[PDB]
Amino acid sequence: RIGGVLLAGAPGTGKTLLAKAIAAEGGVRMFTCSGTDFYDVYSGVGARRVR
Amino acid sequence: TPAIKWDDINGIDEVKKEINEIIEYLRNPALLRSRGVARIGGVLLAGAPGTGKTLLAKAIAAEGGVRMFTCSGTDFYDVYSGVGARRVRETFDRLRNAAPAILFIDEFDAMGAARGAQASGDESASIINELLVQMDGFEDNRGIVVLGATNRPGAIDSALIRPGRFDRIIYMPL
Amino acid sequence: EKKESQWERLTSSRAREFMTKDEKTGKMRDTGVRFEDIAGMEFLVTEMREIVRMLKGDEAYKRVGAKCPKGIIFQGPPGTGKTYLARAIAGEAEVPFFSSVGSEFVEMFAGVAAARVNSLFYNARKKAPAIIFIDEIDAIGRARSTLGGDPGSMERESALLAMLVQMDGIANKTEQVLTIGATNLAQELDAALLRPGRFEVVYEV
Amino acid sequence: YKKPFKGDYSLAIPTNLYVTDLFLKLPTQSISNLTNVENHNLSIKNKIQHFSVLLLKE
Amino acid sequence: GNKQAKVELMEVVDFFRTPEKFKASGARAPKGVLLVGPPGNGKTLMARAVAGESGVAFISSSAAEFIEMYMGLGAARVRDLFNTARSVAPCIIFIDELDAVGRQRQGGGRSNDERDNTVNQLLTEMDGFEAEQQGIVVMGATNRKDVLDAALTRPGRFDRSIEVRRPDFQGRLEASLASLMGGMSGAQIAGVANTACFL
Amino acid sequence: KSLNFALISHSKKLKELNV
Amino acid sequence: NQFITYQSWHSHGDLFIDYHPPKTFSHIPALKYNSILQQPIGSLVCQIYSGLFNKQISKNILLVNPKTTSNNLVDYNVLLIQALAGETEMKIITDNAQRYALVNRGFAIGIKLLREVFDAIALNTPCIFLLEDIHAIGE
Amino acid sequence: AKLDMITDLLVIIDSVRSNKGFVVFATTDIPHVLDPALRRPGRLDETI
Amino acid sequence: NKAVDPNINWYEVARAMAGFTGADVMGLMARAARMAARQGRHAITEDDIYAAMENKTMEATLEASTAGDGGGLVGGEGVEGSPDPIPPQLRRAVSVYEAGK
Amino acid sequence: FSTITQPDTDLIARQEKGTLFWDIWADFLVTAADYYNVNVAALSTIKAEQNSLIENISN
């Protein structure tokens, strides 16, 4: 597998639109999240959320 | 339910009319509606505590010939999560039974505040949600006035200020 | 019969008792200091002697309805002798004395704080008339600093709440229990201890 | 300046700031002719911007 | 050596084990020693020597170890340490790095509540309703003279302001050479000696 | 406070107490 | 009195859906003299009365009432939105964005609360969300 | 004060367009301090 | 997808939209439909899109020149510093200004 | 709907006995308050509940 892909450019130019178009072409549904969401007030929780 | 007259109070002159509004609301509604006051529930008493307070509210009840209930917001929420919601629920049900009444809550900043230096989790949210729904409506609080004593009205959340909760506010001067 | 006993051991009777016989040997838990070794604060000594003699059942001022202050706060800079003054009031009052510290009412388990202050006050109420001394009440009576979700902040708030309730209790009729709190950071106290019914006397030392 | 989407609200365009000052502020006031003052009739700004119990607390 | 602190340490061990002349003169007891000075001049070694001269036990502890994320744990540890001290009857209590805990109890931040509790517990264990008295001396070690609490530096808890500094000419003689290595502490002196031996 | 009939009733009441 | 303040559809936070407020556009005579208000407010009212607002795409509208009112003597933004909901006889859910201005231990609990609120209001359609003081969190 | 809440408020406001049936009214008295990203299309752009 | 007039030179319009992202374009077409409704049409024209760009610029300036008192810049309001029928001298001055520019 | 979504026998019987216990004979708070209460720790096994109960019987 090619694997992880970095999407870069202007702020919010084509990121979610491109991801949704890719998912629609692949016939799958996104599971979108953020790196800010992978955090909590305690330690050892964000890694568990990543897993 | 606890057990110097109103004319024995002389430290206030102008706000005596605003308190007289509460006397006339408890003694004769639909006269208060003819003066534009559709409803009056929560009334906040602010200023320096120790002056008036219980004396004021007792005089209010003694001039309105009406059941008087005393509670402290300190005792409503101590350590128990979710229990305080049922506490204020049962309080308001008892009040709706004995219903002309002047429930007086003391130390309103125990429950009338928002998140801050206390652990604001499920406990304060549940007790303030129950206070909001019991003060708001649906369960008709006919003849029920809640006099809340506070020292920092700006510390009272934007949930109990919204028109229809505790909109009326009385400042006790010196 | 074991978990309740363990909870009682953890959250009960965490103080010291004075001017009573020892529970194991019968020795009188005395301090040895009276109102003669604390010379230098004579007006406050006269005030504390008046408080003690009024607590002992004086009828000289009950005709006018005078009421003995419920709580008494000793504030001032460190080293002025508030502690030695409290030992002198212990040795002179001859009443069951309950000595504790504000820092002794702190634990990591939720409930302990309130249970300890409740139990202390309850023992005082049963052994009436009694004098309670909590050195450095600012560890308990500290005001809320506008922000924070600390477990210590929870414990401090709960210990406050319980204390405020036990304090307003004594007022009602009740058993004529005098509580004394000595501290140096009195300005770091909350907005409720100063109120009437509560620690209504703040003696500046 | 006055572009459709590029110069919308940006505080980097000085003319937008002049427009806000002109339409929301009370004149401008010029430089004083006094001594021991900074530019106007004012001193230097603060560098860093921000019972007995109540008596001691205050 | 050890600046002029050795006379004070002699006084400490003398009224610890054999008062005699102090009881004849009417002096009761010092009840605290606050060693002020930079680290590297044997601040803990002097207290170890005082305990060895007085024939009492020594337990190594510092104020940083009392800083625990469990609320009340540091105050409980301080209380337990003083209870074992009273059980031992007598000993010497050493508290190291007092500048990390006992500093300016004014409040602020969610890291100083337990710290203020520990300072208040230390205050009520050093003084308070008389529960220890006796021949018990508590020694603390700080690098600054007065940065601690006013009650902690009050002369009823730490009533001896014994100060040590870098060794002088005779101190460096004891531990032509002192002209060359004059102006640094004994730890750096020992490091210089070890480097010279390594060369 | 706004312009409603409660204000007119209050004005009439104040006139009656001052008549 | 058909004006009721029931809890959310999920119920047992507490979204506090407000049903049929007792307000009309006669409460605002300042609406008929505002050229800006007429098109969006009339479009919303006619979409509601036609039923199309049920099946329309959700939209966000910013309201600006400049800070000149003394204290909180009847805010005209909430007055206008309550008049819209009362004239249309439509559920209105109000909230303040100050209550979601929470950052603790490097984490924003108010963001999770606002996301939960925005996902919960998706179920009580058709309705009018009224998020006041968006400047408190959108600084 | 960690102001990472803006980049999540942007996603929260942008998620309303996928929804249907309701209308959101965000009120403010100070639109100048509002984030210009929040004024971008797909977000709180329409202003009355 | 939606209803627009087919006689639109989308290149010339996109030339006028130099410096835009794609969601910006989307929202500009939405407010162009709003301007079409304002002029009284269901279809969007290039005139409607240009009016949408002008409306965005004017709204941006108006939310910098009314934030607390304002004055003059927003005429036609029916309140204090805003006569509703923009006077003939004022509209003559505005026309002369814009014609000179 | 209003008739079928009404309390049944269990809920109605738990509404009168519950009222009688926690609402009618919970007025003994004024009695035990004028004689002696501590409350709070009057939960669990404080053993003052027994003394208060026998004092209520003795009157």
Automatic annotation (TrEMBL), chain B:
Protein name (record): AAA+ ATPase domain-containing protein
Residues in AAA+ ATPase domain copies: 39-174
Protein source organism: Chlamydomonas reinhardtii (Chlamydomonas smithii)
Family, as annotated: In the N-terminal section; belongs to the AAA ATPase family.
Top-rank taxon: Eukaryota
Automatic annotation (TrEMBL), chain C:
Occurrences of domain AAA+ ATPase (ranges): 68-205
Protein name: AAA+ ATPase domain-containing protein
Origin species: Chlamydomonas reinhardtii (Chlamydomonas smithii)
Residue window of the full protein shown: 420 to 624 of 1178
